[PDB]
Amino acid sequence: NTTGGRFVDKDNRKYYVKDDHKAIYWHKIDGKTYYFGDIGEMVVGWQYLEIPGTGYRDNLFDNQPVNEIGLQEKWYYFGQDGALLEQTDKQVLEAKTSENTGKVYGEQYPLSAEKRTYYFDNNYAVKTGWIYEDGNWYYLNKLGNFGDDSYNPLPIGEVAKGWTQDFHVTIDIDRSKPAPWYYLDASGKMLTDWQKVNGKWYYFGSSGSMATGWKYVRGKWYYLDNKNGDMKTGWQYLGNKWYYLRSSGAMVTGWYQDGLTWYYLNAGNGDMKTGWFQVNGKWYYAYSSGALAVNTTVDGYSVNYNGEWVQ
Ligand SMILES: C[N+](C)(C)CCO
Ligand SMILES: C[N+](C)(C)CCO
Ligand SMILES: C[N+](C)(C)CCO
Ligand SMILES: C[N+](C)(C)CCO
Ligand SMILES: C[N+](C)(C)CCO
Ligand SMILES: C[N+](C)(C)CCO
Ligand SMILES: C[N+](C)(C)CCO
């Protein structure tokens, strides 16, 4: 809905001039969309820009006041003629790098030899977050890289690999909502269920989020590191109680012999018993270590080689 002007080539740049004024920011001109920056120079290729459509960065010329406004920035792709690529699905394009973005018409730069598939949202920006493609989940980076002032938006929209936190994010991370961990393999596919990574087991479940703490999977209990997710084995002191986890990770219940020493792990909860306890109508005594007293006396009461109380 911008009309009555014309494109002008001047000083190795391209402008759109109407009634003697230069177009700035976003314009829809004769069925195509262009962006002319803060002083009129038409952009080409990859651009990280304030979102169009509100009116505050739209249909504006450089003789008009430019409002203060807070708008998220997103990645957009423009042709070499300045026309916005109005894609809402996906398209293979030159990879955005440090040397092919923020360019204007008239500027020379190398087209990336590397091409990648970029995904787009319904408003022609590069899509971020979770997408489902041909039977798998992929994560498109919502965030760029930080480095003490050094924000680089380049990784946004790119396929994530490896260990990745899914933050709630608009302009910035919302550090009040949860940010679960995921693991994407070498092609970006989200892993589920049990996976061994850097020598340790993790459980990602059906939804892909990395489990922490206690988790019941296929009829057995496992303990994943409360912070780091890695699966524990052996004896573990958790919540002021000992538990014994097999080499497979599965929690033990009932009687368990470590070397010569017997321990009793509570039938349901799995916690190691100490003191006097009953099992199937028999009395047994475990020391503070968990070790079953056998062939000896305890507070006047004697116990046989099975550890059972004898009258
Ligand atoms: C990761 N999923 C998209 C599979 C679900 C959680 O948002
Ligand atoms: C959960 N991670 C393994 C990704 C981080 C460990 O600190
Ligand atoms: C041994 N795990 C149970 C940890 C995974 C493979 O079955
Ligand atoms: C039963 N466990 C203690 C093993 C898990 C949390 O209740
Ligand atoms: C069961 N004993 C009688 C052995 C001790 C009391 O708990
Ligand atoms: C770990 N415990 C203290 C339960 C016994 C030593 O194996
Ligand atoms: C003999 N115990 C009762 C100690 C355990 C194995 O049966």
Contact by Cβ (8 Å): 118, 129 = no
N- to C-terminal Cα distance for the chain? 99
CA nearest ligand 6 atom 2, residue: 289
For residues 232 and 219, give the distance between their C-alpha atoms in angstroms, rounded to a whole number.
Answer: 17
DSSP states of the chain: -B-S-EEEEETTEEEEEETTEEEESEEEETTEEEE-TTTS--B-EEEEEEPSSSSTTBSEETTS--------EEEEEE-TTS-B---SSEEEEEPP-TTSBS-BTT---PPPS-EEEEEB-TTSSBP-EEEEETTEEEEE-S--B-SSS--B-TTTTSBP-EEEE---BSSSB-TTS---EEEE-TT-PBP-SEEEETTEEEE-TTT-PPP-EEEEETTEEEEE-TTT-PBP-EEEEETTEEEEE-TTSPBP-EEEEETTEEEEE-TTT-PBP-EEEEETTEEEEE-TTSPBP-SEEETTEEE-TT--EE-
For residues 155 and 165, give the distance between their C-alpha atoms in angstroms, rounded to a whole number.
Answer: 14
CA 154, distance to chain mean position in Å, is 17
The residue type found at 110 is P
Q: Is 226 in the pocket of ligand 2 (CB under 6 A)?
A: no
The residue type found at 266 is N
Q: Å resolution of this model? A: 2.1
Q: What would you report as the CA-atom Rg of the chain, rounded to the nearest whole angstrom? A: 32
User: What experiment produced this structure?
Assistant: X-ray
The residue type found at 235 is W
Closest CA to 261 of 248, 244, 277: 244
Distance (Å) of CA 245 to CA 136, 201, 234, 268, 289: 33, 14, 5, 14, 17
Ligand 7 atom, smallest distance to 279 CA: 3
Domains of the chain, residue spans = 1-128, 129-311
The residue type found at 299 is D
Contact by Cβ (8 Å): 223, 243 = yes
Same fold flag, 1-128 and 129-311: yes
Ligand 6 atom, smallest distance to 272 CA: 4
Contact by Cβ (8 Å): 226, 212 = yes
For residues 179 and 142, give the distance between their C-alpha atoms in angstroms, rounded to a whole number.
Answer: 12
For residues 75 and 129, give the distance between their C-alpha atoms in angstroms, rounded to a whole number.
Answer: 14
CA nearest ligand 6 atom 7, residue: 235
Q: Is 82 in the pocket of ligand 4 (CB under 6 A)?
A: no
Provide the 10 A C-beta neighbour count for residue 6: 9
b/e per residue 220-254 (b: at least 16 CB within 10 A): ebbbbeeeebbbbeeeeeeeeebbbbeeebebbbe
For residues 181 and 273, give the distance between their C-alpha atoms in angstroms, rounded to a whole number.
Answer: 35
Q: Enumerate residues 6+ apart whose C-beta is below 8 A from 12.
A: 106, 107
Q: Enumerate residues 6+ apart whose C-beta is below 8 A from 248.
A: 233
From the CA of 74, how far away is ligand 2's center (Å)?
A: 29
For residues 289 and 294, give the distance between their C-alpha atoms in angstroms, rounded to a whole number.
Answer: 14
Closest CA to 47 of 20, 82, 71, 18: 82
What is Dmax (Cα atoms) for the chain?
Answer: 110
From the CA of 242, how far away is ligand 6's center (Å)?
A: 7
Contact by Cβ (8 Å): 274, 287 = yes
Contact by Cβ (8 Å): 41, 104 = yes
Q: Is 277 in the pocket of ligand 5 (CB under 6 A)?
A: no
Q: Is 97 in the pocket of ligand 4 (CB under 6 A)?
A: no
The residue type found at 131 is I
For residues 194 and 231, give the distance between their C-alpha atoms in angstroms, rounded to a whole number.
Answer: 10
For residues 83 and 124, give the distance between their C-alpha atoms in angstroms, rounded to a whole number.
Answer: 12
**Half-sphere exposure in the Cβ direction for 80 (13 Å, CA):** 9
Ligand 6 atom, smallest distance to 289 CA: 3
CATH number of 1-128: 2.10.270.20
CA 42, distance to chain mean position in Å, is 35
From the CA of 228, how far away is ligand 2's center (Å)?
A: 5
Q: Which CATH superfamily is domain 129-311 in?
A: Cholin Binding (2.10.270.10)
